[PDB]
Design an enzyme around this catalytic site. Structure first.
Site, PDB file in Angstrom:
ATOM      1  N   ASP A  35       0.824  -1.204   0.000  1.00  0.00           N
ATOM      2  CA  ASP A  35       0.000   0.000   0.000  1.00  0.00           C
ATOM      3  C   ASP A  35       0.859   1.256   0.000  1.00  0.00           C
ATOM      4  O   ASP A  35       1.360   1.639   1.065  1.00  0.00           O
ATOM      5  CB  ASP A  35      -0.914   0.005   1.230  1.00  0.00           C
ATOM      6  N   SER A 199      -0.457  15.651 -12.031  1.00  0.00           N
ATOM      7  CA  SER A 199      -0.695  15.262 -13.414  1.00  0.00           C
ATOM      8  C   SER A 199      -0.922  16.517 -14.256  1.00  0.00           C
ATOM      9  O   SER A 199      -1.473  17.505 -13.778  1.00  0.00           O
ATOM     10  CB  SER A 199      -1.899  14.314 -13.499  1.00  0.00           C
TER      11      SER A 199
END
Length: 330
Positions: A35, A199
């Protein structure tokens, strides 16, 4: 040193991935959920409330000659999906794909919430976010990656998740045969303890690319792709019959649909998520309403590049002094 381990979807939807991990002496092999959105390595154990164990493999520290109680240490964590666990702490030898850390904090669960109990395939979590998020008190503990880092050939690990198929976690090296083209690297902020990056934009299907900064985290421990409501609305508007359902808890779509791809930007590079990756199947057995793999982050408080996004790429988690993230197509 290096390590290399295969990671395997837990079910036919890629809801999560499990990676075998050797704990203790002699080895006890548990299948953990790696994770990159948390920083605790915790396991089902011989100390876990018996009614809360249902099929998991447990760690039994009394059977490990290298286990030592970390006196006074406790832990307690809550995850973004509302699940939780807590317990006490041992140090022990932990190996992943041939890479061995001695003195790793292994957090032994006394209590786990129902979602963990109900998932017999996940024996615990192995956190790979930054150690500043580790919940052990009164002495915060280091992640497996943090502990291994100095010994690694290069201070990196990589995530290569498969679509409906196994993939690979590598530690300490970049497998140049595992991706196509070049790796594009992008800046990381560790201010929230995550692999947080920005992004450069998105496209829906064959549509034009929208240049826009989307801050979010690279999170192998989250199934879906969670993005701003504007972005998600633009995507599902291209699927006839798709709608947001409060009763189901997100966007649903007719199972008869052909889903468009979704592209996200990494600097000047582009990662394409095929439409099939965004199908998470009937909302309930036999339903013709299917659950979408792109969902709104509104009310999460953060955008999450989860498995839906990450499995479309070869992803480098660069843990150099100034960390960065790399993405390649594959």
């Amino acid at each position: 040193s290096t390590g290399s381990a295969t990671t395997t979807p837990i079910d036919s939807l890629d809801d999560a991935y499990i990676t075998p991990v050797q704990i203790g002496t002699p080895a006890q092999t548990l299948n953990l959920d790696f994770d990159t959105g948390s920083s605790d390595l915790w396991v089902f154990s011989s100390e876990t409330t018996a009614s809360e164990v249902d099929g998991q493999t447990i760690y039994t520290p009394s059977k490990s000659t290298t286990a030592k109680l970390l006196s006074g240490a406790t832990w307690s964590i809550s995850y973004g999906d509302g699940s939780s666990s807590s317990g006490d702490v041992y140090t022990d030898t932990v190996s992943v794909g041939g890479l061995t850390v001695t003195g790793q904090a292994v957090e032994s669960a006394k209590k786990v919430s129902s979602s963990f109990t109900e998932d017999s395939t996940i024996d615990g979590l192995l956190g790979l976010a930054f150690s500043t998020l580790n919940t052990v008190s009164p002495t915060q503990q280091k992640t497996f990656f943090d502990n291994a880092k100095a010994s690694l050939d290069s201070p990196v690990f990589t995530a290569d998740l498969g679509y409906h198929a196994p993939g690979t976690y590598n530690f300490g090296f970049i497998d140049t045969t595992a991706y196509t083209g070049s790796i594009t690297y992008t800046a990381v902020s560790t201010k929230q303890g995550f692999w947080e990056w920005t992004s450069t934009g998105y496209a829906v299907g064959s549509g034009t690319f929208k240049s826009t900064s989307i801050d979010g985290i690279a999170d192998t421990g989250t199934t879906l792709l969670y993005l701003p409501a504007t972005v998600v609305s633009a995507y599902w508007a291209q699927v006839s019959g798709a709608k947001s359902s409060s009763s189901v808890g997100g966007y649903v779509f007719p199972c008869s649909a052909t889903l468009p791809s979704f592209t996200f930007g990494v600097g000047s590079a582009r990662i394409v998520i095929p439409g099939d990756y965004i199908d998470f199947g009937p909302i309930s057995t036999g339903s013709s309403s299917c659950f979408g793999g792109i969902q709104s982050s509104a009310g999460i408080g953060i955008n999450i590049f989860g498995d839906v996004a990450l499995k479309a790429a070869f992803v480098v988690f660069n843990g150099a002094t100034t960390p960065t993230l790399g993405f390649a197509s594959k």
